[PDB]
Amino acid sequence: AQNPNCNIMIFHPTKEEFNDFDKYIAYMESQGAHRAGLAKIIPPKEWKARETYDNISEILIATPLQQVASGRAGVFTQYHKKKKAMTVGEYRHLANSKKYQTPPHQNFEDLERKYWKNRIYNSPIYGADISGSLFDENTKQWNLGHLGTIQDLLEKECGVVIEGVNTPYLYFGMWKTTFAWHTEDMDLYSINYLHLGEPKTWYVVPPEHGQRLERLARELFPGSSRGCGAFLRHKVALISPTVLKENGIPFNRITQEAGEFMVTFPYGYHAGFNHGFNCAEAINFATPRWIDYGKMASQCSCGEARVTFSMDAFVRILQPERYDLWKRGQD
Ligand SMILES: O=C(O)CNC(=O)C(=O)O
Ligand SMILES: [Mg+2]
Ligand code: NI
Ligand SMILES: [Zn+2]
Numbered sequence: 001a002q003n004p005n006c007n008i009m010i011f012h013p014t015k016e017e018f019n020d021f022d023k024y025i026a027y028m029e030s031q032g033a034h035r036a037g038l039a040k041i042i043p044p045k046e047w048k049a050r051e052t053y054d055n056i057s058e059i060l061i062a063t064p065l066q067q068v069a070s071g072r073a074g075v076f077t078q079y080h081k082k083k084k085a086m087t088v089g090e091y092r093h094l095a096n097s098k099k100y101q102t103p104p105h106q107n108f109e110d111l112e113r114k115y116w117k118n119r120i121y122n123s124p125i126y127g128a129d130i131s132g133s134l135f136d137e138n139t140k141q142w143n144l145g146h147l148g149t150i151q152d153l154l155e156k157e158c159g160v161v162i163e164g165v166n167t168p169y170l171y172f173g174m175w176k177t178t179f180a181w182h183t184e185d186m187d188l189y190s191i192n193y194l195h196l197g198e199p200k201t202w203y204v205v206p207p208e209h210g211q212r213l214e215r216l217a218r219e220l221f222p223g224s225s226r227g228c229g230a231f232l233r234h235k236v237a238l239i240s241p242t243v244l245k246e247n248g249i250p251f252n253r254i255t256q257e258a259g260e261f262m263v264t265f266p267y268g269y270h271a272g273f274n275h276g277f278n279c280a281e282a283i284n285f286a287t288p289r290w291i292d293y294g295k296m297a298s299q300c301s302c303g304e305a306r307v308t309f310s311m312d313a314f315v316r317i318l319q320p321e322r323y324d325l326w327k328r329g330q331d
Contacts, residue, residue, distance in 0.1 A: 003032025006206035008039060008252045015044040018141045022148065025189075025263070025287060036252060037268025038204040041261040043142065050136040053196045056279070057089030059170070061127035064091065067178055069120040074240035075220050076120050078178060083125060088172060088279075091127055095174035095277035100124060102175040102198065102276040108255050112201060115273050116240045119176050127172035134170065134195050134281055142261065144168045144193060144283045151310070153286040160317050164310030168283040173200070173274030180235045181213070181271040185307055186314045187297040188284040190264040192256070198276030200256045203241060207267040209250045213239075216247050233300035238271060266293035294318045301329035 003009065009031065013024055024041075033039040065080040086094070094100060105111040133145040140146075149166040175198075184190050194200055205213045214232065218225040221237055228234070244251050256262050258278070264270055266289070286294075295318045299305075312330075316323050 001032070002030070003035045006035040006037070006208070006250065006252070008036045008204065008254050009033045010040045010042065012042045013044060015046045015141075018044055018047060021142060022287065028263070029289070033263075034265040034268075035206055035208065036204060037206050037265050038202060038252070038254065038270060039263045039265075040254060040256065041263065043259065043261065047139075047141060049139055049193065049195060050134060053134075053279075056134070057087060057092070059088040059130075059132070061086055061088065061091055061130060061172060065126045065128055066123050067126055068123045069238075071120065073117060073120055074243040076238050077221070077224075077236045078180060078238065079236065080126075081123075088127075091125070091172055091174075092277050094125065100174050108199065108201070108275075111275060115176060115201075116242070119178065119273070122176055124174050124176040124178070126174070126177040127170075130170040130172070131167055132170050133168050134279070142193075144191060144281050147191075147283065147285055150188065150284060150286040151313070153288075153290075154314070154317065157288055157291055158317070162313035162317060164313050166284065166310065168281050171280040171282065173197075173276075173278045173280070175274065175276050177274045178238065179270070179272050181217070181237055181239060181269055182232055182235045183210070183267050183269055183297075184264065184284055185311055186318070187267045187293040188286055188290060189266060190282055190284050192262045192264075192280055192282040194256050194258050194260055194262075195279045195281060196258050197278030198274065199258075200272055200274050200278065200280065201253065202256060202262065202270055202272040203244075203251055203253050204264070205249065205251050205269040207265060210267050210269050212249050213269050216244075216249055228300055228302040228304065230298040230300045231302075231304075232269075233298070233305040235305075266290050267297075291318075299326050299329075301325045303329050306330065
């Protein structure tokens with residue numbers, strides 16, 4: 001069995017290996033990459049996503065989200081308070097202001113210590129989930145707006161043609177902006193490219209151990225757990241590495257820098273934070289190996305998780321018994 005300790009693997013494809021996206025994901029899995037739940041891909045030195053980032057300031061962040069925490073430093077939830085629209089140039093100036101900027105620090109480990117000690121006492125503003133792409137249309141390799149769609153994969157594997165579309169999303173971050181513990185919708189893969197700016201630190205639980213994280217989360221968030229049998233789908237709960245280690249939950253950590261891709265694998269729980277002003281692009285995708293995960297994925301039916309148009313067909317075809325209850329949650 002390849003990668004039996006479920007370590008995060010780092011790949012350095014050549015320009016020739018970077019041509020065929022599906023084939024390289026399958027290669028990474030042949031080496032056991034998926035057992036970690038997360039892998040890093042460093043593009044070949046010849047590759048670029050676009051020529052420059054000098055002309056992005058007029059992108060609009062229509063609904064910036066202020067991430068307000070409740071709880072204790074290692075075990076907290078966050079809610080998202082909607083703020084007035086601002087441009088990327090306005091948001092970058094805000095991120096760099098004395099109120100929001102990254103503090104002085106020694107290295108990534110010192111900054112991680114400061115994040116976990118102090119996150120709850122601040123409310124950073126995240127420009128998340130913005131439909132769009134920063135890949136140049138002429139970038140032919142690993143262009144997140146030109147991937148094979150999940151609807152086409154389902155059709156290729158299972159023969160059923162379905163409605164829906166699959167497009168990327170931009171994330172503009174600042175110091176302490178936070179992504180809560182989650183797997184993807186329908187336990188899909190994700191791919192995330194850090195286009196510019198400061199790093200993003202990730203935490204991940206191997207898919208084979210995801211139920212250990214879920215049982216801890218039910219213990220730590222007991223009211224939320226009574227409210228919903230899949231409340232991590234709400235994407236609001238945070239648990240620190242120290243707390244994970246105290247409770248024996250297997251996990252790994254890695255820091256992504258500008259110019260690097262991360263891939264999350266089906267049912268790989270992940271969480272993390274941004275180091276300072278940055279911009280990432282991410283999209284979900286599927287492979288043949290995903291189908292069995294999609295069929296078994298938990299679902300939120302309490303009404304909180306509210307998701308995209310295209311998840312309807314995935315539930316309807318892969319989980320017909322759950323469809324009626326899930327759809328009631330959506331309506
Ligand atoms: O970058 C973020 O805030 C969150 N991204 C992801 O969870 C992902 O790419 O799957
Ligand atoms: Mg612009
Ligand atoms: Ni994710
Ligand atoms: Zn729910």
